[PDB]
Amino acid sequence: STQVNAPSFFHLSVLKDVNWEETPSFIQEKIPLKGIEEKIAMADSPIIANEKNEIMWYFLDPEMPTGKLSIIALKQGSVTPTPLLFQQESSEPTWTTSNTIDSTTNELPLTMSLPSSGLWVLNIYVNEKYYDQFVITAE
Amino acid sequence: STQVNAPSFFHLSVLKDVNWEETPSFIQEKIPLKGIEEKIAMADSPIIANEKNEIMWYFLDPEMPTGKLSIIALKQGSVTPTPLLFQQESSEPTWTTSNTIDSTTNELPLTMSLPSSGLWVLNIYVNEKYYDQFVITAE
């Protein structure tokens, strides 16, 4: 992007095969989840633009890599990446959790906010290495 | 912005009276400086887009407020704020220094990078309160 900075581990090429449709919900242990089955997902909770929402994240992958977790978001039709973490009443959006996750973390609450309504792709990194991605809807 | 998140203390209204011209250099103690005289300035060093450059910052204000220092940048013609700090070989751009400055700090080295060439306004906050702003040129 000519307009903003992004982490050095972020490349636009992750956008290449994105299917711009909301990721379908699925049930894990009787509760609704959104994301990639058997890998990573968040609680199927409604996301309202410009509203900080604490959403439980789930690390389904039994071999989840160790490291800090990063989430880099882009709106549909955008080449401008943005952070969505607003941790612990912070006034600043952060790319990366302060805590380190691993195969034993299982679950972690993250407070998120998206600046406008529409489809957003969530690019996920662990220890600065690309992990996966999925699309969510902000109302 | 509909496209990215920004710190809650950042408002677009800081753009209102910006004069979109490079801030003129001035001499302080025999060395060239860019910024606001008697307040805050950086060494007059060439800024090359997409090149991390460690630039010495100077706190001229004898009553410089105490707090972490934030810099929020916007390119000319942009409503999309971005961080420019790349501290201590970090792969991530940060809004805010990890260290707290005060009236006795005087000087501090900051490593910066701008994503594209042109005029950029630098909005400066201390302890999350607006301090000042000035325009620089990236080549």
Quick one: which of A138, A67, A61, A31 has its CA closest to B2? A138
**For residues B80 and B101, what is the distance between their CA atoms, to the nearest angstrom?**
27
* Contact check, Cβ <8 Å, B91/A5: no
The tokens describing B72, both together, are 């929020």
Query: Tell me, what DSSP letter sits at residue A91?
Result: S
Helix then strand then coil, % of chain A, to nearest 5: 5, 45, 45
B30-54: b (≥16 Cβ within 10 Å) or e: eeebbbbeebbbbbbeebeeeeeee
Q: What is the DSSP string of B3-24?
A: S----TT--GGGGTT---SPPP
Count other Cβ atoms within 10 Å, centred on residue B100.
12
Which chain A residues are within 8 Å of B5, Cβ to Cβ?
82-84, 86, 93, 113-115
Listed resolution, Å: 2.4
* Contact check, Cβ <8 Å, A115/B84: no
Instruction: With beta carbons less than 8 A apart as the criterion, state whether B107 and B59 touch.
Output: yes
Residue B17 backbone phi and psi in degrees, to 5:
-115, 20
Which of A91, A95, A96 is nearest residue B128 as measured by Cβ atoms?
A91
Q: What is the CA radius of gyration of chain B?
A: 14
Architecture of domain B1-139: Sandwich (2.60)
Which chain B residues are within 8 Å of A6, Cβ to Cβ?
93
| Residues in chain B, overall count | 139
Q: How was this one solved?
A: X-ray
C-alpha distances in angstroms, A58 versus A96, A100, A105, A112?
A: 16, 14, 9, 15
Instruction: With beta carbons less than 8 A apart as the criterion, state whether A5 and B113 touch.
Output: yes
Chain A's closest residue to B118, CA to CA, is A2
Q: What is the CA radius of gyration of chain A?
A: 14
Q: What is the dihedral of CA A39, A59, A49, B122, to 10 degrees?
A: -100
* Contact check, Cβ <8 Å, B5/A113: yes
* Contact check, Cβ <8 Å, B82/A115: no
Can you name the residues that pair with B82 across neighbouring β-strands?
B73
**For residues A6 and A133, what is the distance between their CA atoms, to the nearest angstrom?**
17
Residue A87 backbone phi and psi in degrees, to 5:
-90, 135
Quick one: which of A116, A74, A126 has its CA closest to A96? A126
**For residues B112 and B114, what is the distance between their CA atoms, to the nearest angstrom?**
7
**For residues B133 and A137, what is the distance between their CA atoms, to the nearest angstrom?**
36
Contacts of B54 (CB under 8 A, 6+ apart): B109, B110, B111
Contacts of A38 (CB under 8 A, 6+ apart): A60, A61
**For residues B62 and B102, what is the distance between their CA atoms, to the nearest angstrom?**
9
**For residues A31 and A25, what is the distance between their CA atoms, to the nearest angstrom?**
10
**For residues B106 and B124, what is the distance between their CA atoms, to the nearest angstrom?**
16
* Contact check, Cβ <8 Å, B4/A82: yes
